[PDB]
């Protein structure tokens, strides 16, 4: 459970955001791409797979199966992609919302809403929590 | 010491790397970027303080302290910009020429690059060493 992740898309602005989220934590890490192509994913996975464990991504419908690079990706950095396993997708427009006008491009948006959503919890913060695990777990 | 970082530049086929190193582990985020104008540099520490305790970016240079987004950026996150504080840059070409031919992008030649650096050491590897860092310090 410290290296399981579930990959998402979600749309704003006609462009499509990819969330991957920490299950266990609910840390969070997105990024706004121009289409949704293979080789995006594929990308954002193996920077993912440099910062964190990642051992298994989870993915709701069959887009990521039909990918060479995602394949090829995965099989370079030792990732195991599953089928099956959020309301994320609501907490971040929410916050993207409240940010949408302190700055120009979606993208920035997103990552001002990304880092509340991992900062804010007194409790853990989700930020605070994927550490935890991963130390807790070395 | 768990929040500091340096931020460099380095150059390969005519474009810019960004290089983020946490100074106590060893740790590195990198990206590629077009031109290495102030909003690139602003979009790169706003996504790695929403991932990581960032405190203070310590730079070599003038350039950072002439961006207005870079200034607004750090200020939104908490950064503190400090002046003065490598051969990080080598280590990090040394493994990109290995992979150069394994992918067709730069950009992903950097990024396994960063995974084999971070994961590599039997000590710890540099990203076992900032999870420890900041989960010893939580
Ligand atoms: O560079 C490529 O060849 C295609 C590619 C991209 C991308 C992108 C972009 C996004 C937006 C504009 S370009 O990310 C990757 C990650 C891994 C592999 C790969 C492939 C084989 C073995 C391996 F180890 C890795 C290939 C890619
Ligand atoms: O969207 C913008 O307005 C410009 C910008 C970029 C970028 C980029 C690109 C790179 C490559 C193509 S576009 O990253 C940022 C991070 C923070 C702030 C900012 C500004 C004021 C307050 C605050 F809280 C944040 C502005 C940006």
Wanted: include cysteine; glycine fraction near 8%.
């Amino acid at each position: 459970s410290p290296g399981i992740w579930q990959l998402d898309c979600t749309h704003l602005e006609g462009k499509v955001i990819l969330v991957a989220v920490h299950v266990a934590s609910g840390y969070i890490e997105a990024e706004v791409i121009p289409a949704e192509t293979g080789q995006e994913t594929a990308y954002f996975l193996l920077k993912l797979a440099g910062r964190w464990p990642v051992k298994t991504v989870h993915t709701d419908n069959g887009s990521n199966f039909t990918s060479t690079t995602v394949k090829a990706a995965c099989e370079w950095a030792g990732i195991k992609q599953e089928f099956g396993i959020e309301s994320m997708n609501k907490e971040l427009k929410k916050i993207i919302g409240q940010v949408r006008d302190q700055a120009e491009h979606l993208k920035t948006a997103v990552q001002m809403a990304v880092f509340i959503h991992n900062k804010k919890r007194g409790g853990y913060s989700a930020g605070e929590r994927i550490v935890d695990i991963i130390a807790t777990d070395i």
